[PDB]
Every structure is written in structure tokens, then in C-alpha cells.
């Protein structure tokens, strides 16, 4: 029906999908962290 | 056959050792010096870690054979929550007793005598049932785990209310969760009733023998029923660490030595978690037999001999609405042979105190058809309960 509210917050899902451990447990997430570090991001993950 | 372990769920085998470990006279270059895994280096093999100082919590569980009480002969232990397949038959075989249906004549007279009743028996027992089933809890429908012990204590108090008329019930006391252990060798099988029951009434004065000498002698001509495919030890815990010692629930010098009545409660909200009636009868028979054996061996001795003075124990099993009464007279101690005298046991089974109880009023077609209260009430069950309570005095 009405859209726009597709984001339902939940810290468990947030940290399990985009967390530091989730990023570091895979070689692609390590590349993501390396790219964010090369760009100089203040926050590398959630 | 069909192995019950799935490979993907079992503990995976350790990886194959590196090829550098198969070269004789060659030292492997591993990553043990850097204290971390590093690719390209060999996998170091470590000896089993030896915690030179032992820790109670964080040590491996010692094996069973290391225990000082470990024995080679297997003992068949019957604890509180042991179930029997052929309940009454297995109990009669393991205890070498003869089963009788009706209650003994002494307790039957003590019940049918109207002079031994409480002032308002019908109303008192109805109020006790209603309080146990509905009133004792603030919830709408209390659970069995709450209304079984409540109703047992209510009946116990209704029986205790008779001490003003019989000034002899003060010679008793109650006990909860006392370790009982009675082991005996029967037909080259070492059985042991060992554990703790629900409630135990003890008394200073023993219970008089209730079986007549004619019945005791006719017991010699009775043979025990046998089951061929099933073993008598079906349902018992086969253990190897145990103590062959007649340890009753108390120490020496106990002022209330003689056990009067055991009380077993099936206070479980689930049918599979509760006991069947037959299994409950078997459990109460076995525990009464263990108590009688403990008392007999503490009185006369550990020698196997027919008792010239029998030991009478009583037992009551309560499902919440179904009562099973047992009077067990132990007469012998030698149980290896199946030829001598056997004990006796009168078991009144399936004694309904009340058929049903409505915690809420039923309404069908906008009119109440059955009010709140117990539907159907058999006062003979409480009469037998009071007889079993007053049997000591």
C-alpha cells in the first residue's frame, strides 16, 4: 500500500549484516574495509 | 546395519598432516614460534596440554572406573523416576510378594467404623477438594503441580484433626527427601531400591502385623507370575558405581524409627511426564519394600532369614484425583531363592476421590447447566485414607 517505511530498525540485524565481525569474516568485506580506509571514512562499519 | 550418526553432523576428522612430517630425519618448519597461524608453514602438532595444577571446574570429567566405589558387577537401581513395563508383575517378582486386591480387614474395619469420622466429613472433604482445585491459587485454573501436594496436605490435616480424639498420633513426624538405599540379591540379580520419595511419615511405635498366619502359610503355595520375553530388570538403571550398605533415611538413635506411610505425588502438568497407574503402583510397592527391608536389617541384622515379626508399611500414591493405597507386609529377607515364604501386599487401585471439577461455570444456550464444584464424589476414598492414617493408633 503505502511505501517509504521499508526500514524497520533493529540493532541485532544491523550489527549482524553490516557489523565489523560480519565485514571481517569474509575476504570481500575485508576489501570493503580496506576501500573505506583508503577513502578515509570516519566510520568503517556499524 | 544402519548407523545412527550422520557424517555432516559428527565431529569431523582432523586434517591430513603436512607432507613434511613423512620425511624421516627432517624437522618441520611450523608457525609455533610466532604463536599464530600463518599460511605456507607446516601445521605444528602439540602434545596434550598438561595443567600441572589441577582446576576443579575446568578439568576433564574423571572416568567411571577411576571412582573408588566402582564395581564390576552391575547393580540394577530403582530410583524415584524409574518406570516399569509390566509394573505390578515386575514389582511382585522383584520383591517376592503376593498381591491381594482389597484392603486388609483391620484397616477396612477402621474405615467402616463411623465413630472414627471427623465432625463434618462430607463438607470438610468437599471444601478441601474445592480449595485444592480452585481456591488455593489466584489463577483461574490451577495446575496439577500446584493442586496435587495441596490436596495431599489438606487430607493430611483433615486426618491430623483426629488427634484430639486419639491422643496417640503425636508419636509421628514427617520427613521430606531422605536418602533411602536398600539393596538385595534376588535370583543372582543385585537390585537396589535407592533414592528419595515424596513424603515419609515416621513413628515411634511399629505397625502391628496385619496378615494372619493362615495367609502367611498359604503364601508358600503361591507362585510368582513370570514374563518370558521381558527381563525383570526392565526399566531399572544398570550402574557399576554403587554401595551395598543398608542406609535408611536417618542415622542411629532416631526417635521416630518405624516408617508408617509413604506418600507419592504425580504432580506433573503433562501426561507423558506423569506416571501411569500401574507404574505408580509398582514404584510405591518397590519403595515400601525398600523401607521395610531397611527397617528389618536395622532391627534384626543383614542375615537372610524369614522374619518371625513381620514389618508392615503403608503407601499412598496421588495423581491429584486418583488414589492408590498399598499395605505391604514384609515377612522374609532371603530373596535369592523363589521357593520359601513370600511377603504380602494389599493394593487398592483406581480409587476416585472425585470424577471431575469445574473451575468455571459452564454455559450452554445462555444458561448455566453445571455450577462450580466437584462433579461426583466418593467419600469411601477418604474413608480408606483416614483408615490408613489411623492404622497406627
Amino acid at each position: 500500500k503505502a511505501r517509504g517505511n521499508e526500514y524497520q530498525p533493529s540493532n541485532i540485524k544491523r550489527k549482524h549484516k553490516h557489523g565489523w565481525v560480519r565485514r571481517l569474516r569474509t575476504p570481500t568485506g575485508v576489501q570493503v574495509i580496506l576501500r573505506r580506509m583508503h577513502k578515509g571514512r570516519k566510520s568503517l562499519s556499524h | 546395519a544402519y548407523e545412527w550418526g550422520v557424517r555432516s553432523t559428527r565431529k569431523p576428522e582432523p586434517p591430513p598432516l603436512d607432507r613434511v612430517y613423512e620425511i624421516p630425519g627432517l624437522e618441520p618448519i611450523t608457525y609455533a614460534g610466532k604463536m599464530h597461524f600463518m599460511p605456507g608453514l607446516a601445521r605444528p602438532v602439540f602434545p596434550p596440554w598438561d595443567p600441572g595444577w589441577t582446576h576443579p571446574k575446568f578439568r576433564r570429567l574423571p572416568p567411571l572406573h577411576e571412582h573408588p566405589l566402582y564395581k564390576d558387577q552391575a547393580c540394577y537401581v530403582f530410583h524415584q523416576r524409574c518406570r516399569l513395563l509390566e509394573g505390578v508383575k515386575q514389582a511382585l517378582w522383584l520383591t517376592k510378594t503376593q498381591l491381594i486386591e482389597g484392603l486388609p480387614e483391620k484397616v477396612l474395619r477402621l474405615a467402616d467404623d463411623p465413630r472414627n469420622h471427623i465432625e463434618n466429613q462430607d463438607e470438610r472433604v468437599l471444601n478441601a477438594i474445592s480449595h485444592a482445585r480452585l481456591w488455593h491459587s489466584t489463577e483461574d485454573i490451577p495446575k496439577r503441580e500446584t493442586y496435587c501436594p495441596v490436596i495431599v496436605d489438606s487430607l493430611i490435616q483433615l486426618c491430623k484433626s483426629q488427634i484430639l480424639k486419639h491422643p496417640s498420633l503425636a508419636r509421628r513426624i514427617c520427613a521430606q527427601n531422605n536418602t533411602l538405599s536398600a539393596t538385595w540379591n534376588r535370583e543372582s540379580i543385585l537390585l537396589q531400591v535407592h533414592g528419595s520419595s515424596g513424603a515419609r511419615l515416621n513413628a515411634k511405635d511399629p505397625l502391628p502385623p496385619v496378615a494372619s498366619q493362615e495367609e502367611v502359610e498359604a503364601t508358600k503355595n503361591h507362585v510368582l507370575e513370570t514374563f518370558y520375553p521381558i527381563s525383570p530388570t526392565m526399566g531399572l538403571q544398570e550402574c557399576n558405581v554403587y554401595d551395598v550398605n543398608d542406609d535408611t533415611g536417618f542415622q542411629e538413635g532416631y526417635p521416630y524409627p518405624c516408617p508408617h506411610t509413604l506418600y507419592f505425588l504425580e504432580s506433573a502438568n503433562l501426561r507423558p511426564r506423569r506416571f501411569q497407574p500401574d507404574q505408580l503402583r509398582a514404584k510405591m510397592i518397590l519403595f515400601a519394600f525398600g523401607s521395610a527391608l531397611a527397617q528389618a536389617r536395622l532391627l534384626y541384622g543383614n542375615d537372610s532369614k524369614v522374619l518371625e515379626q513381620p514389618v508392615v508399611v503403608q503407601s499412598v500414591g496421588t495423581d491429584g484425583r486418583l488414589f492408590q493405597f498399598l499395605v505391604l507386609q514384609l515377612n522374609t529377607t532371603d530373596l535369592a531363592s523363589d521357593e520359601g515364604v513370600k511377603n504380602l501386599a494389599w493394593v487398592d487401585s483406581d480409587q476416585l476421590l472425585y470424577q471431575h471439577f469445574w473451575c468455571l461455570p459452564v454455559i450452554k444456550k445462555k444458561v448455566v447447566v453445571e455450577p462450580v464444584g466437584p462433579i461426583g464424589f466418593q467419600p469411601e476414598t477418604f474413608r480408606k485414607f483416614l483408615a490408613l492414617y489411623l492404622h497406627g493408633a
Partner: protein, 159 residues
């Protein structure tokens, strides 16, 4: 790994193709190390062995660039160390057989200073050098005591 032309025609389609060797699980016995290794070898490996007239001969003759096998380099290092050490664990009950085995491989005898560095990669060599150079830091008490002893000996000899 490469490409190929279907129907062997240049003007036809180009198709990626992976040509793989035929592996075989064979058991090879070594005379110097005295062990039968169940190895995945090829017909070319067996042919090179038959051409060198021996498994140990083939291992000791073919270099690293022709072996292309870390396990082969480890085997070579092991047998070279054994030949350089004259290991009595080869045949403790047959000294004559041990000597006869050690004589026929005399052309590849390499000293011990180089026999333990042939089948090592760069990481393994760095780890070995680190384990060799791993020395605990000596306390400054020892250095100061040595300095004081030197000064005292100098003052004693200068009188």
C-alpha cells in the same frame, strides 16, 4: 588454460579450453629414506623416473624448476640431509647395506651448511632464520658488571 578454435578453423568460434593431466595414485618406494609414499603422480613422472633409473635419482637430478612440487623439494631436502649426515637410522641392523646405498648416491653429496636450505620457500626460510636469531635480551646488569670488571682490571694493571 587457453583458447581454441572449434572445428580447427580460424574463422570459426573461439572457445576457452582447460587441458588437464591424467593423475594416478601410485606408491613409490625410496631407498635413502626407506618409505613407500602414496603419491598422485602422472605418466610423465613415471617416465622421468624410469629415465633416471630410480626414484631417488630422479629427485636428486631434476631441479626445483623441473620438479615444480613443494613435496618433491621436501623429499630432496630430506634425502640430501640424510646423505650429508650419514644417518645410521637408515639401516641400524645393516651397516653394509647402508654403506652400499650411500655410495651409489655420492655424486649428489652436498655439505650440511647447504643441505638444509634447498627445499625451503621464502616464508619458511625467514621463519628458520628468525628461530636461529631468536635470542633473549641479556640484562643490563651483566653488561654493567662486565664494564666494571674491565675498568677494575684496567686500574689494577695501570699501577
Amino acid at each position: 588454460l587457453g583458447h581454441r578454435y572449434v572445428n580447427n578453423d580460424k574463422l570459426s568460434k573461439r572457445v576457452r579450453k582447460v587441458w588437464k593431466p591424467q593423475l594416478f595414485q601410485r606408491e613409490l618406494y625410496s631407498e635413502i629414506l626407506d618409505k613407500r609414499f602414496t603419491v598422485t603422480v602422472t605418466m610423465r613422472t613415471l617416465d622421468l623416473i624410469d629415465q633416471a633409473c630410480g626414484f631417488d635419482f630422479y629427485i636428486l637430478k631434476t631441479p626445483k624448476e623441473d620438479l615444480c612440487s613443494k613435496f618433491g623439494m621436501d623429499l630432496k631436502r630430506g634425502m640430501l640431509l640424510r646423505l650429508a649426515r650419514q644417518d645410521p637410522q637408515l639401516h641400524p641392523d645393516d651397516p653394509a647395506r647402508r654403506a652400499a646405498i650411500y655410495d651409489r648416491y655420492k655424486a649428489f653429496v652436498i655439505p650440511e651448511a647447504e643441505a638444509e636450505w634447498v627445499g625451503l620457500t621464502l616464508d619458511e626460510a625467514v621463519e628458520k632464520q628468525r628461530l636461529l636469531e631468536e635470542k633473549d635480551p641479556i640484562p643490563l646488569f651483566k653488561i654493567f658488571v662486565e664494564e666494571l670488571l674491565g675498568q677494575l682490571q684496567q686500574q689494577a694493571l695501570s699501577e
